[PDB]
Amino acid sequence: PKPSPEAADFAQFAPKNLQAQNFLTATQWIGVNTQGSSLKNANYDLRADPIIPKADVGPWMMSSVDPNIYQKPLF
Amino acid sequence: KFFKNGNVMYTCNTFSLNVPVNNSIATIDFAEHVNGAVFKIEYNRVNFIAPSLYPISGLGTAVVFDLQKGEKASQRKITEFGNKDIRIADEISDIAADDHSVLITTKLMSESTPGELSRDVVLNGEIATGRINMNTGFVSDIIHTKKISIIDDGIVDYYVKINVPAKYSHGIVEVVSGTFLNDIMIHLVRNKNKWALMDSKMYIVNNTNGFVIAKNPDTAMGVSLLEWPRGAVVFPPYYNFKKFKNVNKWSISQQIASCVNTSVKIPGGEYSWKIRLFFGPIWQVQESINSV
């Protein structure tokens, strides 16, 4: 699965010079976006807003603002 | 607070020539690697479930031995005059039964052989349920270790550990909750006279003469003790109590003094206990152990 010029095969040595890897990163590179769309609508008032599921009942006014619930309320 | 996440203690303890030596012939070592918060160990269809709630919860071969409790070690460090369960230093915060409010320091494992290093806690917290006061910090200064070493033969050696600068009391080696579905309770005497099957009393306390223990409803768990400390260095008449209790679901006990000695102090070193457990049908357990 490799062209010959790429490297000398590693054997009979153990300096621990190089890493093993999958060679691809994605979400863990860019970083997880915690905001999502939750700040388009808002909870300016402090009590947590009970959630009514985003059931997309209508075909024309779906929206994409996310549930926006506070992770932990003030209680 | 007294419910702080952790604390430290200093104990001053000195002695000269008034301490016998209990040889803790069993010891523990590790060559395993650090894991996170759960183990799932299998060999020969024997599973061990080790949740974050505490490291030994359930096990079996498509069966379980309890619903609620796994094994734990503990101590009764001081039992002033034979009083009640005042100071039980359990490895499980069973008082909560939901959060494991027990500091864990290291959790090494490899497939087939998990280990453990953890601190214990005061089972009663700070509440003086007796006529005496108990302790201060919830988390105590005693550490425990485990090694659950499964051997290709279908057997597992279970090692536990206890240490404290000084104790002249009662130790709790394993608090076990074997299910009530083990109708046959049978053990062999070291004189190899017979297997002493007895169920008329359902009150079984297997003393020193008891060699190995087994229980089953025709599918069995075997128990064979290997090593425990003794003052076997010069063999003095110093107390070294070893016995089992089967009046409860199951418990393994070890005691040093009857709440107080005449005038003797304590090594304060490491204590150890190595017990061999293994599983299979009534036939396989009996056939294997009868080899010795």
Binding site: Q19, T25, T34 | -
Partner: protein, 436 residues
Amino acid sequence: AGGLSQLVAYGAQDVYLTGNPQITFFKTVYRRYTNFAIESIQQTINGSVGFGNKVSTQISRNGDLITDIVVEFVLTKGGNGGTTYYPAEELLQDVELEIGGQRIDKHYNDWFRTYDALFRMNDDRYNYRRMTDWVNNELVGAQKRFYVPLIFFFNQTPGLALPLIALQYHEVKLYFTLASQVQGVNYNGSSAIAGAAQPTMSVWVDYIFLDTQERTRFAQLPHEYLIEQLQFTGSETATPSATTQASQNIRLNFNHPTKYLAWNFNNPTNYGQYTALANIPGACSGAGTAAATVTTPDYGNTGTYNEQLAVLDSAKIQLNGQDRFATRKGSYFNKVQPYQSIGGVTPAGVYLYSFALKPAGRQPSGTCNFSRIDNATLSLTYKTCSIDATSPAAVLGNTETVTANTATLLTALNIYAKNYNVLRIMSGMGGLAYAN
């Protein structure tokens, strides 16, 4: 007599102090560490070095971890003593930290000045200035080498050193923008100085060389580091000279757990100027005599301690339409907050409000995570710039709500947020745990 007097005079309250001892002060046991050596190694620079030019360095793996990167310059004066003010920082206009192709952080000239204004304030601010400015009344033509230690998350403490051996498949590199104008070197005020030579620069990287057993673990094990980031976009103000005590509500654009906010009101022409110019000592060029000019600072004394020359009358931070604390006057954020949170002098014109008990430290101690809130706004009330900057009787003699007529030059509003993020290093590649 002597020490035995107190030892025998032992009491009951002492059970809280010396009873049942847990520690002593006279038997220190030291913790044995992992063998390492530190080396200062010059890295190469790509790009033509000069004023207004951009350069970068791709940092090689000389060692295991990076502990400290210091940028240095060789500069000549284009003017006499007092014509400069931290010219090394003005020159080091933008520093961008890239680990694997994605921005991790970026620091600005003005930030370096702000950090120095806030956090690096003991004998270290004088030695810092020795590294970055002219401090001995040097004359035209004097040459010295300048050092500008960088303050990214891995430079402040060795515990956050960047493991290269853990990141073999990602490049680690810095970009540097060199200012087109450096006061007292290429320009005197706004006019070019003839004969201004281009600078020489080098980027030194201090490497950690550590022994084999730990080096193996670094390469083989994944890592998570708690790191700092600087968030920044600049804005502008509208400070009046007359008819109103103006207000401004600027919408902030920050995310992630913030340790503190800091800001100043800068002069876009005179680097590091955060207060008004006045005909008082150190406040303007020629101050105190007839030749005093109030439009140009006495640059070597650009920083001052007189809040009377500030433009900020009051401020509060409003979160989601509601005030998180009540209004304070501007001197509060210049003096009281850094007293409580840092423990040093903050020059006038630089302001901080902390969310943290110890923002000067590394460990988290209270944050405001702007990723969960809808509206972060900084509300400012400004001083009326209606007293004569050239008359000491007025500059040193007026009320709290009025400042110098020259103060309106401080039109650049620089608001910074210092936050936490987590750097995730896995299988020779890294990035941020979270990003907005």
